[PDB]
Design an enzyme around this catalytic site. Structure first.
Site, PDB file in Angstrom:
ATOM      1  N   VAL A  24       0.875  -1.163   0.000  1.00  0.00           N
ATOM      2  CA  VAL A  24       0.000   0.000   0.000  1.00  0.00           C
ATOM      3  C   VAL A  24       0.915   1.217   0.000  1.00  0.00           C
ATOM      4  CG1 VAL A  24      -1.830   1.293   1.178  1.00  0.00           C
ATOM      5  CG2 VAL A  24      -1.897  -1.206   1.187  1.00  0.00           C
ATOM      6  N   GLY A  25       0.465   2.278  -0.665  1.00  0.00           N
ATOM      7  CA  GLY A  25       1.242   3.492  -0.761  1.00  0.00           C
ATOM      8  C   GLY A  25       0.295   4.654  -0.918  1.00  0.00           C
ATOM      9  N   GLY A  28      -2.206   4.281  -3.554  1.00  0.00           N
ATOM     10  CA  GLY A  28      -3.208   3.256  -3.330  1.00  0.00           C
ATOM     11  C   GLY A  28      -2.540   1.898  -3.226  1.00  0.00           C
ATOM     12  N   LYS A  29      -3.361   0.864  -3.361  1.00  0.00           N
ATOM     13  CA  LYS A  29      -2.864  -0.493  -3.218  1.00  0.00           C
ATOM     14  C   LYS A  29      -2.284  -0.989  -4.538  1.00  0.00           C
ATOM     15  CE  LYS A  29      -6.798  -2.045  -0.892  1.00  0.00           C
ATOM     16  NZ  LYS A  29      -7.623  -2.558   0.243  1.00  0.00           N
ATOM     17  N   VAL A  30      -1.283  -1.860  -4.436  1.00  0.00           N
ATOM     18  CA  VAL A  30      -0.613  -2.450  -5.591  1.00  0.00           C
ATOM     19  C   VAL A  30      -0.879  -3.941  -5.531  1.00  0.00           C
ATOM     20  CG1 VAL A  30       1.541  -2.765  -6.877  1.00  0.00           C
ATOM     21  CG2 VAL A  30       1.208  -0.717  -5.458  1.00  0.00           C
ATOM     22  N   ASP A 141      12.110  11.599  -7.468  1.00  0.00           N
ATOM     23  CA  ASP A 141      11.825  10.753  -6.319  1.00  0.00           C
ATOM     24  C   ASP A 141      12.696   9.527  -6.371  1.00  0.00           C
ATOM     25  OD1 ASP A 141      10.552  10.421  -3.894  1.00  0.00           O
ATOM     26  OD2 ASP A 141       8.813   9.410  -4.747  1.00  0.00           O
TER      27      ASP A 141
HETATM   28  N1  LIG Z   1       6.103  -3.276 -10.948  1.00  0.00           N
HETATM   29  C1  LIG Z   1       6.094  -3.778  -9.693  1.00  0.00           C
HETATM   30  N2  LIG Z   1       6.335  -5.081  -9.477  1.00  0.00           N
HETATM   31  C2  LIG Z   1       6.319  -5.617  -8.241  1.00  0.00           C
HETATM   32  N3  LIG Z   1       6.084  -4.911  -7.122  1.00  0.00           N
HETATM   33  C3  LIG Z   1       5.839  -3.588  -7.199  1.00  0.00           C
HETATM   34  C4  LIG Z   1       5.807  -2.934  -8.506  1.00  0.00           C
HETATM   35  N4  LIG Z   1       5.522  -1.635  -8.280  1.00  0.00           N
HETATM   36  C5  LIG Z   1       5.357  -1.483  -6.940  1.00  0.00           C
HETATM   37  N5  LIG Z   1       5.540  -2.652  -6.302  1.00  0.00           N
HETATM   38  C6  LIG Z   1       5.440  -2.878  -4.844  1.00  0.00           C
HETATM   39  O1  LIG Z   1       4.303  -2.175  -4.368  1.00  0.00           O
HETATM   40  C7  LIG Z   1       4.539  -1.686  -3.053  1.00  0.00           C
HETATM   41  C8  LIG Z   1       3.896  -0.303  -2.938  1.00  0.00           C
HETATM   42  O2  LIG Z   1       4.662   0.609  -3.725  1.00  0.00           O
HETATM   43  P1  LIG Z   1       4.466   2.211  -3.693  1.00  0.00           P
HETATM   44  O3  LIG Z   1       4.699   2.732  -5.091  1.00  0.00           O
HETATM   45  O4  LIG Z   1       3.167   2.477  -2.979  1.00  0.00           O
HETATM   46  O5  LIG Z   1       5.677   2.718  -2.758  1.00  0.00           O
HETATM   47  P2  LIG Z   1       5.437   3.818  -1.603  1.00  0.00           P
HETATM   48  O6  LIG Z   1       6.790   3.969  -0.951  1.00  0.00           O
HETATM   49  O7  LIG Z   1       4.283   3.405  -0.732  1.00  0.00           O
HETATM   50  O8  LIG Z   1       5.078   5.208  -2.340  1.00  0.00           O
HETATM   51  P3  LIG Z   1       6.214   6.346  -2.520  1.00  0.00           P
HETATM   52  O9  LIG Z   1       7.530   5.632  -2.309  1.00  0.00           O
HETATM   53  O10 LIG Z   1       6.043   6.899  -3.919  1.00  0.00           O
HETATM   54  O11 LIG Z   1       5.864   7.301  -1.401  1.00  0.00           O
HETATM   55  C9  LIG Z   1       6.032  -1.794  -2.809  1.00  0.00           C
HETATM   56  O12 LIG Z   1       6.159  -2.865  -1.879  1.00  0.00           O
HETATM   57  C10 LIG Z   1       6.635  -2.344  -4.077  1.00  0.00           C
HETATM   58  O13 LIG Z   1       7.494  -3.444  -3.768  1.00  0.00           O
END
Ligand SMILES: Nc1ncnc2c1ncn2[C@@H]1O[C@H](COP(=O)(O)OP(=O)(O)OP(=O)(O)O)[C@@H](O)[C@H]1O
Ligand SMILES: [Mg+2]
Length: 283
Positions: A24-25, A28-30, A141
């Protein structure tokens, strides 16, 4: 740039089963999913369209990634805006983030050559952003959670929601930005220097519980290198594994990236070459 129906997203994610949540970020959720009758694994981001920041990051990611192709960038497969939703569909990165293999984790520690190859891969992606698109792209970022690893450990830069283009997180912010108020690709170089010290020292960029001089890795590590004690804050797994000439080349490159003034920092092409030179010096 493919457009997916919302029913395809729902099918790919098994109706957004919590089984498939990768994280989650703020956006939103991934979710982990598969498309194309199960032959292609994907990461699926479901945002909240009521949010201005989410909407701005959604549109920024699409406008940026729809035109980029590089081995060291996560690929945007498509998006879904159906039912006024904000969904982004990426290539799946099976080994997660660089950060999850450095500290606060039960993953085993990475060998030094593998860490250096991950830093070179990320540097190639950033160099492409600064020199290979129609205009310079400033990522804004760069950090160890925004470098992902695929199943063959290839490093990929991700998360373009804050990037900016065209001829105009706390421990990674360029301090000169708060003084000169200018946008430059040298602000990515700064952030990337912090990532290099993270790979070496295996600790957060910012640890707010420490003694004042240690809180920010961007300030602490150059200081330790000048006082001849950088080896004492290196990741314990790495001790005795870095040759003296590699160590000096790597450390001097990272120190130049976090200089106070962006005009004195190297370009990413210069960073990339010095890292590949450091890798040769390790052999
Ligand atoms: N293409 C991808 N393949 C596998 N895992 C991913 C992918 N993109 C994101 N993730 C996973 O999704 C999770 C959430 O990622 P997110 O982008 O929300 O990072 P965040 O740190 O919460 O936001 P930010 O860093 O931009 O503030 C992370 O654990 C990351 O490992
Ligand atoms: Mg992220």
């Amino acid at each position: 740039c493919r457009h997916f129906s919302f029913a395809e997203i729902k099918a790919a994610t098994k109706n957004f089963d919590e089984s498939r949540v990768l994280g989650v970020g703020g956006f939103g959720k991934v979710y982990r999913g598969e498309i194309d009758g199960g032959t292609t694994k994907v990461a699926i981001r479901r945002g909240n369209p009521m949010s201005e920041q989410g909407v701005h990051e959604f549109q920024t990611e699409i406008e940026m990634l729809s035109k980029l192709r590089h081995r060291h960038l996560v690929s945007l497969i498509g998006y879904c805006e159906e039912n006024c939703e904000m969904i982004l569909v990426y290539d799946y990165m099976a080994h997660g983030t660089m950060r999850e293999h450095l500290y606060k984790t039960q993953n085993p520690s990475l060998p030094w050559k593998q860490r250096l190859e991950i830093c070179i891969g990320a540097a190639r992606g950033l160099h492409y952003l600064h020199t290979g698109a129609k205009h310079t792209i400033i990522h804004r970022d760069v950090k160890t959670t925004n470098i992902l690893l695929d199943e063959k450990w290839v490093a990929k830069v991700s998360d373009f929601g804050l990037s900016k283009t065209g001829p105009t997180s706390f421990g990674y912010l360029d301090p000169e930005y708060f003084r000169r108020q200018q946008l430059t690709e040298k602000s990515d170089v700064y952030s990337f220097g912090v990532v290099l010290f993270e790979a070496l020292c295996a600790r957060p960029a910012l640890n707010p519980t420490l003694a004042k001089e240690q809180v920010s890795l961007a300030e602490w590590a150059p200081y330790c290198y000048k006082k001849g004690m950088l080896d004492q804050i290196v990741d314990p797994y790495l001790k005795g594994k870095i040759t003296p000439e590699c160590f000096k080349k790597f450390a001097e490159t990272a120190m130049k990236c976090v200089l106070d003034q962006g005009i004195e920092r190297p370009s990413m092409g210069d960073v990339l070459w010095n890292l590949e030179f450091a890798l040769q010096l390790q052999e």
